[PDB]
């Protein structure tokens, strides 16, 4: 209702770098809020695409940002009569970026990896990897939990069980408040999908450069399955954390599997042991239900609510005709040990091919009325098709069907304005939480400030 669309701030990265594909607020030890931006097609120093990360300090005028440096050199290790290989070409560094305390985790989901042993190999495959950085000290660590040293043959001999070769770890990511980093690897277990968890502190303390295969004893990976419903389900395409069992001592994970059960799609709520607590099934095949997930309390009862996005949902229209618009599903959490029921509200896009619900961002209490609010992205929405982000204020009844405010893309066609979103943080220190919107097609980020 009160995000200022006139007074915007534009941050820009280099051409073709997809600056703004991912972003987050980062807060230094002093308290100063900055914006971390992922740019997964940034050219490395040798003119080859590696991707990159930028750390923007808050300015009204915005502009260019400094690059947060990472090692972009490939590595080889001849150890244990094997040959370990890392490949950072086209790795997509910054495809996801998340901040926790004084640490920034930027992932390269398509970093490849191989192991050679005589005439045999494990196969050169995208295991993914995440680069952890602590800017105020300079410390760097990495985390790449799907790397293995098992040869091609042994997988064949074991009917491809526990095959982590195609994980794409860090495809999605979130950190708990305690400091557990959770990564989505939708290519895990032969495209079934998996989650990898590990304390940020333990990732730092077990990492040394050049080792390539090391143990993080505290880490916890999800499980492989022979259930056909899970095959090619991309479990971990999106990921989030919240409180859904009523026990503050434990943390619950929300995982998106958008092609689960023959492209029906699904979102699951799990405990930290990866036991299923509830499963939300998709409504319509190929709608990509689970592309986006958001956790926040919108009705002011203290219990976190769930928001799932299905950006390719086709709505029914006159004369049996379907129209791809996108849909967001709101699930309010009830009291006591009770399951999440049917959706309390369905929000459906209006523009054809608009991909409404491609991103859903908790804004916090935007208008400071007691209820939390959210923003939903329609990256090709609006009459022009340029893109559109829609603000929805919360209330006792859940959310409003009618949006309180609509932000139109200030960038040209193709920008993907709204593909990334983040809020619930006061960047200018005026007492109201603000919103950052990425437009990777345009290589830019737009900051909107909340006013009284």
């Amino acid at each position: 209702l009160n995000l200022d669309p006139v007074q915007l701030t534009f941050y820009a990265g280099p051409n073709g770098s997809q600056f703004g594909f991912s972003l987050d607020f980062h807060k230094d030890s002093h308290g100063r809020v900055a914006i971390v931006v992922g740019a997964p097609r940034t050219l490395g120093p040798s003119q080859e695409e590696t991707g990159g990360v930028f750390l923007c300090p808050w300015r009204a005028e915005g502009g260019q940002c400094p690059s947060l440096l990472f090692d972009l050199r490939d590595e080889t290790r001849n150890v244990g009569s094997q040959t370990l290989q890392t490949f950072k070409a086209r790795q997509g560094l910054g495809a996801s970026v998340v901040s926790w305390s004084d640490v920034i985790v930027a992932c390269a989901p398509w970093q490849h990896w191989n192991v050679l042993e005589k005439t045999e190999e494990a196969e050169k495959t995208p295991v993914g990897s995440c680069f952890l950085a602590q800017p105020e000290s300079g410390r760097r660590a990495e985390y790449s939990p799907c790397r293995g040293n098992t040869l091609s043959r042994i997988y064949v001999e074991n009917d491809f069980s526990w095959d982590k070769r195609y994980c794409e770890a860090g495809f999605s990511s979130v950190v708990t408040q305690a400091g557990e980093l959770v990564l989505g690897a939708p290519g895990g277990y032969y495209f079934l999908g998996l989650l990898a968890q590990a304390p940020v502190a333990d990732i730092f303390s077990s990492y040394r450069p050049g080792i390539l295969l090391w143990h993080v004893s505290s880490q916890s990976l999800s499980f492989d399955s022979s259930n056909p419903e899970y095959f090619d389900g991309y479990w971990g395409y999106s990921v989030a954390v919240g409180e859904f069992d009523g026990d503050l001592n434990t943390t619950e994970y929300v995982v998106g599997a958008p092609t689960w059960s023959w492209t029906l799609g699904a979102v699951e709520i799990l405990d930290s042991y990866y036991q299923r607590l509830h499963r939300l099934r998709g409504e319509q095949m190929a709608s990509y239900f689970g592309h986006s997930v958001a956790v926040t309390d919108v009705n002011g009862d203290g219990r976190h609510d769930l928001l799932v996005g299905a950006p390719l949902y086709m709505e029914s229209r006159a004369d049996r005709k379907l129209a791809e618009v996108g849909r967001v599903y709101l699930f309010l959490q009830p009291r006591g040990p009770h399951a999440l029921g049917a959706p309390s509200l369905l929000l459906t896009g209006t523009q054809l091919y608009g991909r409404f619900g491609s991103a859903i961002a908790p804004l916090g209490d935007l208008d400071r009325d007691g209820y939390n609010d959210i923003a939903v992205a329609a990256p090709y929405g609006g009459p022009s098709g340029r893109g559109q982000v829609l603000v929805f204020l919360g209330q006792s009844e859940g959310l409003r069907s009618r949006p309180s405010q609509v932000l139109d893309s200030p960038f040209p066609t193709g920008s993907a304005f709204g593909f990334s979103l983040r809020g619930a943080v006061d960047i200018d220190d005026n007492g109201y939480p603000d919103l950052i919107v990425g437009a990777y097609g345009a290589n830019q980020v737009a900051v909107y400030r909340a006013q009284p």
Epitope: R77, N78, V79, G80, S81, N149, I154, S206, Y207, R208, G210, I211, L213, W214, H215, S217
Partner: antibody
């Protein structure tokens, strides 16, 4: 606290077999490779082999192929070394080892098990 | 197999000294070397892994160095506790192979 707890001293007869054990404490045996090493005063340290208890796959020095069989059991967090066809040369102190972080390293050791072959 | 030749086999040194123990491989082993300690009548304790990295809890006075086929362990300022046997081990290739050892002895 990581700690490898090996079985006590063995006094065995030549020709027989013996089976030494190595039990994890403060961690799970399937967490890393587990190695076995031989020590003698004159001949020094010799690497016998390793096992990956998660799947049972093993590797051996040709010198100990056939004599030494390494196994492991995750239900009891224990790895084992079995030496068949005991000879005087098998009289040694036997250690189990695992790495700290590096997959291929040899950082944590058991207290050792003394094996004496005699008639 | 890779032959690891450790030198010297023993040295007579004093408290506060800085000593070094060299270890030569029969071929290049790209820092894939460990350093072990065995105190009299006790078991083994890891000191260095992958050439230069100290094992958790190992005192700063220990340090590794080298490359290719030639590596060194350096204890700076000897403690009474440091009079023990020390071994190198390579893991560039299976089978893993050990040096002969070095015994630090009290000079008198």
């Amino acid at each position: 606290e990581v700690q490898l707890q090996q079985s006590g001293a063995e006094l065995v007869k030549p020709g027989a077999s013996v089976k030494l054990s190595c039990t994890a404490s403060g961690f799970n045996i399937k967490d890393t490779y587990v190695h076995w090493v031989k020590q003698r005063p004159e001949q020094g340290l010799e690497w016998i082999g390793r096992i990956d208890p998660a799947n049972g796959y093993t590797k051996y020095d040709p010198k100990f192929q056939g004599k030494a069989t390494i196994t492991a059991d995750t239900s009891s967090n224990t790895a084992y070394l079995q030496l068949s066809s005991l000879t005087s040369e098998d009289t040694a102190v036997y250690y189990c080892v695992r790495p700290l972080y590096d997959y291929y390293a040899m950082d944590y050791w058991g207290q050792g098990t003394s094996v004496t072959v005699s008639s | 197999d890779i032959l690891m030749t450790q030198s010297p086999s023993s040295m007579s040194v004093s408290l506060g000294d800085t000593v070094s123990i060299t270890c030569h491989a029969s071929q290049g082993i790209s820092s894939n070397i460990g350093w072990l300690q065995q105190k009299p009548g006790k078991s083994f304790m890891g000191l260095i892994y992958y050439g230069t990295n100290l094992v958790d809890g190992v005192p700063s006075r220990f340090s590794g160095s080298g490359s290719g086929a030639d590596y060194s362990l350096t204890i700076s300022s000897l403690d009474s506790e440091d009079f023990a046997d020390y071994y190198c081990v390579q893991y560039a290739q299976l089978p893993y192979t050990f040096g002969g050892g070095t015994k630090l002895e009290i000079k008198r």
